[PDB]
Subunit: 147 residues, 4 copies
Amino acid sequence: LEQIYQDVILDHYKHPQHRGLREPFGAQVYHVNPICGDEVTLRVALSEDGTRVTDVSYDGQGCSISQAATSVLTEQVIGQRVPRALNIVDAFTEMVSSRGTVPGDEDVLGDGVAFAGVAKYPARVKCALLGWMAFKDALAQASEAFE
Amino acid sequence: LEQIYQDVILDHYKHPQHRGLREPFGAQVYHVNPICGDEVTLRVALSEDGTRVTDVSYDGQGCSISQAATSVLTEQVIGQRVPRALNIVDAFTEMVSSRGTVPGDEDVLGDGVAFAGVAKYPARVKCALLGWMAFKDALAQASEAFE
Amino acid sequence: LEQIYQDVILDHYKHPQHRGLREPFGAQVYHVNPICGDEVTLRVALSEDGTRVTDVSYDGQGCSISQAATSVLTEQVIGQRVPRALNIVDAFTEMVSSRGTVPGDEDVLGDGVAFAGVAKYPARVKCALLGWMAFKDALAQASEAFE
Amino acid sequence: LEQIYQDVILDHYKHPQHRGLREPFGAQVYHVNPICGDEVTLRVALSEDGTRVTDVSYDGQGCSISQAATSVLTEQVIGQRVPRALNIVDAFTEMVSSRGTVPGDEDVLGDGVAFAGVAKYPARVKCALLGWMAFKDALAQASEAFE
Ligand code: FES
Ligand code: FES
Ligand code: FES
Ligand code: FES
């Protein structure tokens, strides 16, 4: 299982989904971690009626875990209705910041469950969160067009 | 109209007017958007008597909308007397931050009216403003030589 | 002695030990000196039981003294039990910030004693500390996994 | 005179004296202008007894005026006793920030008098000061070794 999770992370690190900034988009955010210095620029696009995430595009520098996590994020939320995307994000963030007491559900997170073991390394939690909290922020800002 | 405005923006994105920093100049400003991380460095030059904008030069990174908007800015204000430039800037900023309730006048703004639809996307308003507020700031600073 | 210490520093500057960021790791820190503008990104890896420093990897820009000091740091602490690493760091920092009144012990510091003369140049003390305080910070953060 | 001063500035812009960071040095400072975004990294070296400026080395980005001014700085202060360097700096800064009421003396400043006309452009005063205030700061820090 430990070895399987490693393979998931390597798969997403080497074969990132949805990498590189694209247009169109509703909101861009730039998040820089104040501790490790790594950064993500992330864009969200919504459908015409604002109900679905139609694109998530991103660039930046980080460790393999943060790059893998942002890859997994895009695969889980693109095409999803906004409330569902938010639910996935809350599930992921609950899991990685639970200090190992919340295992995560693969039916919700998919490959996202591969980051369960990060929860037991406090200084690496930020790596899993960088892209996901950038998404939460960008999704909120893009959604303002539809309030 | 929606399709026409798209063409204006693409025209200015692909064929930017007045791009690249030049000398001489009266003031340079560096503006970085704290949300999206994009930036503009912008210079203003005034005539010998300080009554006309003789140059606006710029560099930086941004989305296609912000780059297009800065291109349009330069075309509208270069050669203009300072009070007129200020009037154009106020008209543009009124338009893009009106949430769609101010359509903008093409006789004042020219191609600037192509950014009317941005007003309905709160998270993209910053894109239209980046270069224009840099200009307002640089013009004010360059004008201090003539008070 | 003055000439010998110069050779140590040049040796580590030209032939850096352990340079370049590597995986795996427990914590990364990014430290930027607010005065000179130089920076280090530094990673620490601990053993499975968290008792030994198994890796220290780093990148960044600095003067030859700061680059040499980070090289020496890695050679002194990699393979060491955590309490011993901390003891070496405290000895080094005591030495360089003592204004020359603490000569340092080569049995503890090894090549680290070559930085004794830096202590008499207040504005260069930061150069010796940059990598060492980055290590102290990263080691502390990596250790949180084992509390 | 206006045309002569232009030639001085162009001469120093195209043929900078003492450009590029060098070792050894006593202090490095990194100054970033908060308005225009330009920056200088500047090093000072003093003699063994701390009485003379033996080197000033620098790098960074700026307009032609700021680059020319830093070039002129190095030519005026390198080889000078510290109190004399300070006197030159105070004379230069008095001149450029006097709003044109202090013409500057060529026997003190040399080519530095070419920046007299900058004083009448408030937004360009920062350009003349960037390198000179970096020097004042670095000289002070390097001098701490000799208090
Ligand atoms: S160490 Fe910076 S995001 Fe992982
Ligand atoms: S998203 Fe940064 S200026 Fe448009
Ligand atoms: S001058 Fe910056 S680390 Fe030495
Ligand atoms: S405009 Fe930045 S130093 Fe001159």
